[PDB]
XYZ file of C-alpha atoms in Angstrom:
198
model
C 0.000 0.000 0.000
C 2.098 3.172 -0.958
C 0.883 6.506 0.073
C 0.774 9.778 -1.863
C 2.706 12.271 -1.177
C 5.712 13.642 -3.367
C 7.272 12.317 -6.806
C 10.451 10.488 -5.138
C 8.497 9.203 -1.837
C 5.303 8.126 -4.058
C 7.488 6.208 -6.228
C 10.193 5.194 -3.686
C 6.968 4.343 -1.623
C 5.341 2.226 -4.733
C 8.595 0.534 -5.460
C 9.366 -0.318 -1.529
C 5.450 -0.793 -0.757
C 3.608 -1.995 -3.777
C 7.454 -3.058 -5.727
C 6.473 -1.460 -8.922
C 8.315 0.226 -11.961
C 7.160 3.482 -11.602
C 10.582 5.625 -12.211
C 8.962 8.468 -14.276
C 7.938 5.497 -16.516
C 5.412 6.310 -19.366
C 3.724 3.159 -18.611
C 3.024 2.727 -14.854
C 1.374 -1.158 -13.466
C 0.676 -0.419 -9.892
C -2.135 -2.676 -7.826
C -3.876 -0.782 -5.029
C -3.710 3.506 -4.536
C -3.554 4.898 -1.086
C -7.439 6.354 -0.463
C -6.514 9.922 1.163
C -4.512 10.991 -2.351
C -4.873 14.661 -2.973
C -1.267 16.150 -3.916
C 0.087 14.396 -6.577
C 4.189 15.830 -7.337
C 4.453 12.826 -9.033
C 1.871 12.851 -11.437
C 3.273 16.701 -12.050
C 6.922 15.624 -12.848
C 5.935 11.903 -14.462
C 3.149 13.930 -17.012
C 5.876 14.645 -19.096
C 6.944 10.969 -19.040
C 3.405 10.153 -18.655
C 0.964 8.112 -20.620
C -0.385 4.763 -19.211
C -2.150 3.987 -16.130
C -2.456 0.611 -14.535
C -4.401 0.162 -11.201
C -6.195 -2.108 -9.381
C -8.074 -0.888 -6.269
C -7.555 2.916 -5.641
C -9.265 5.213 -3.490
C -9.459 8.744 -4.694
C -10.473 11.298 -1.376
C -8.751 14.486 -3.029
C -6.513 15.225 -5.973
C -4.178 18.554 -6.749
C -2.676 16.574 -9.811
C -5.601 17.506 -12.040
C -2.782 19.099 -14.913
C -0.490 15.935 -13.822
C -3.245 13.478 -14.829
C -4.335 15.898 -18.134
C -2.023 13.964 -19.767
C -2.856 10.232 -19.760
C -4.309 8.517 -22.626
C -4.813 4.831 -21.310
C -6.146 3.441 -18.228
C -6.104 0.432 -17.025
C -8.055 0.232 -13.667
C -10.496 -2.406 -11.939
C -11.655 -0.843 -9.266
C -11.743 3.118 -7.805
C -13.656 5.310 -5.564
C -13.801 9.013 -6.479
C -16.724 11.513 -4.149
C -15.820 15.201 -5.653
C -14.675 15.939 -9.018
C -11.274 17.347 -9.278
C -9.142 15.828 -12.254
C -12.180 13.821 -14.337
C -12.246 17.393 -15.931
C -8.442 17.131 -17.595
C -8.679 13.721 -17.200
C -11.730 13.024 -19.010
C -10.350 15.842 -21.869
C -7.224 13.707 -22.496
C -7.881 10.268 -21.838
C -8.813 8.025 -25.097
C -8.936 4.549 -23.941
C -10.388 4.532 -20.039
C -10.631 0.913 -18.702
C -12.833 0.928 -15.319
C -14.027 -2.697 -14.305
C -15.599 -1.350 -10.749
C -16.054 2.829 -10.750
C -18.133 4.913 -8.056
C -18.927 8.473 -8.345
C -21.281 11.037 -7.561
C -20.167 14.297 -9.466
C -22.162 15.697 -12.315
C -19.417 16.983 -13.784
C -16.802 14.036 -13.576
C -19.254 11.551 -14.634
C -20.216 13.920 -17.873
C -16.548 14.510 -18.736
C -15.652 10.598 -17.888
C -18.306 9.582 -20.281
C -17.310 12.368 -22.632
C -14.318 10.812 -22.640
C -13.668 8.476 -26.169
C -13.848 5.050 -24.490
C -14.077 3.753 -21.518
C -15.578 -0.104 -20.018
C -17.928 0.564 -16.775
C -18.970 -2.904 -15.878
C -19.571 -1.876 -12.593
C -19.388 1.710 -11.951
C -21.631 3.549 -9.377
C -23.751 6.609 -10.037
C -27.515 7.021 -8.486
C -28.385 10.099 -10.314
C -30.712 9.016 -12.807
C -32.374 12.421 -13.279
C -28.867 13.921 -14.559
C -26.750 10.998 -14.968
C -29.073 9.259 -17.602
C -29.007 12.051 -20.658
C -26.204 14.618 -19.012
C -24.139 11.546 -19.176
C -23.336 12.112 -23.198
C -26.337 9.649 -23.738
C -27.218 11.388 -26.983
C -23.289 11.238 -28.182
C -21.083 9.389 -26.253
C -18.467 7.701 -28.505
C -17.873 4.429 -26.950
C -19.082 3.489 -23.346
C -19.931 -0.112 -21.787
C -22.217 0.024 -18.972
C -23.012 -3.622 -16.930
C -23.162 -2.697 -13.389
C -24.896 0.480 -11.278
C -28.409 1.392 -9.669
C -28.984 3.356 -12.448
C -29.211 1.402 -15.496
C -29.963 -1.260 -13.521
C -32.751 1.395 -12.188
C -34.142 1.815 -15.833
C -34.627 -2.253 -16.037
C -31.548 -4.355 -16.136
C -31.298 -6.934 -19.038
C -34.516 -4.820 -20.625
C -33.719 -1.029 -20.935
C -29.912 -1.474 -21.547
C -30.953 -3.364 -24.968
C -33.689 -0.836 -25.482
C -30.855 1.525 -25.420
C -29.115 -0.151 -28.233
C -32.694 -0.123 -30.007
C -32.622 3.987 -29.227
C -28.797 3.993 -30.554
C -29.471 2.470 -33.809
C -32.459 4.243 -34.349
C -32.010 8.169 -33.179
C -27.817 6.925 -33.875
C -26.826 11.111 -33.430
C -23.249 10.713 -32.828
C -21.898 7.795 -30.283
C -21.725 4.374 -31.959
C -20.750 2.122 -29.151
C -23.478 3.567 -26.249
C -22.823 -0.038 -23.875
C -23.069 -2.319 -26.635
C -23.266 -5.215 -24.033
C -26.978 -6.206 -24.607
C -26.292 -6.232 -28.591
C -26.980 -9.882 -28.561
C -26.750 -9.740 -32.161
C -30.203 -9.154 -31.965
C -29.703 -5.085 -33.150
C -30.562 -6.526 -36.683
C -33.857 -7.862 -35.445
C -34.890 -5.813 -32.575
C -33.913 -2.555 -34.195
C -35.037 -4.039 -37.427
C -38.907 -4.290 -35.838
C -38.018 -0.841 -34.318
C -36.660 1.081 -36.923
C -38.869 -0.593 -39.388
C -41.666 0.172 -38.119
């Protein structure tokens, strides 16, 4: 478990504590994050040598790094916990590929700039806000976005409204092309056929 603190104890910490490669490396495979993050000197020096992300379990309390992190592109994470929003902004405006098995959040504006984002695999991410969340959440343009695990969709009707989104995709298809195309079921030539038909 290495803490957060500055650039040569975070990664002096990660390679003592969770004996990683950090080193400035452009490619970073740590496990587990330290939950009371918030200043992130590393991030700040590494974003020049900065560009993939690999975590595991990370809680996020507070982060300063916002301009440290506006320079990834790929992240590989399974699990994170994130309250305020504080670097999903810069984040979300550089990142491309965004790989989140297990996600919570409750910001408005992280989860619209996460999902914003180009990418990203939410197959269990955690956001209540159904009044917001559901459209604000780039549901009429979002690029690419899977979405198998949260109280919202799984508000709307689990295996029954996340294929009816599919149905709305190919049908009012605006902009995003991949809006959680894990209910396509190959059945988007049928269903959407009977719905777009007709």
């Amino acid at each position: 478990m290495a803490k957060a603190t500055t650039i040569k104890d975070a990664i002096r910490i990660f390679e003592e504590r969770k004996s990683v490669v950090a080193t400035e490396a452009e490619k970073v495979e740590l496990h587990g994050m330290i939950p009371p993050i918030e200043k992130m000197d590393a991030t700040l020096s590494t974003l020049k040598a900065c560009k993939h992300l690999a975590l595991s379990t990370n809680n996020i309390e507070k982060i300063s790094s916002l301009s440290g992190m506006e320079n990834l592109r790929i992240l590989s994470l399974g699990r994170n916990l994130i309250k305020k929003i504080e670097n999903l902004d810069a984040v979300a405006d550089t990142l491309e590929e965004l790989w989140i098995s297990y996600n919570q959040i409750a910001s408005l504006s992280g989860i619209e700039k996460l999902v914003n984002l180009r990418v990203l695999y939410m197959s269990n991410n955690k956001i209540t806000n159904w009044g917001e969340i559901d459209k604000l959440a780039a549901l009429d343009k979002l690029e690419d976005l899977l979405l198998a695990g949260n109280p919202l969709y799984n508000d709307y009707k689990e295996n029954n409204a996340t294929s009816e989104y599919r149905i709305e995709v190919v049908k009012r298809l605006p902009n995003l092309k991949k809006l959680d195309g894990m209910p396509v079921d190959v059945d988007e030539r049928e269903q959407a056929n009977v719905a777009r038909g007709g």
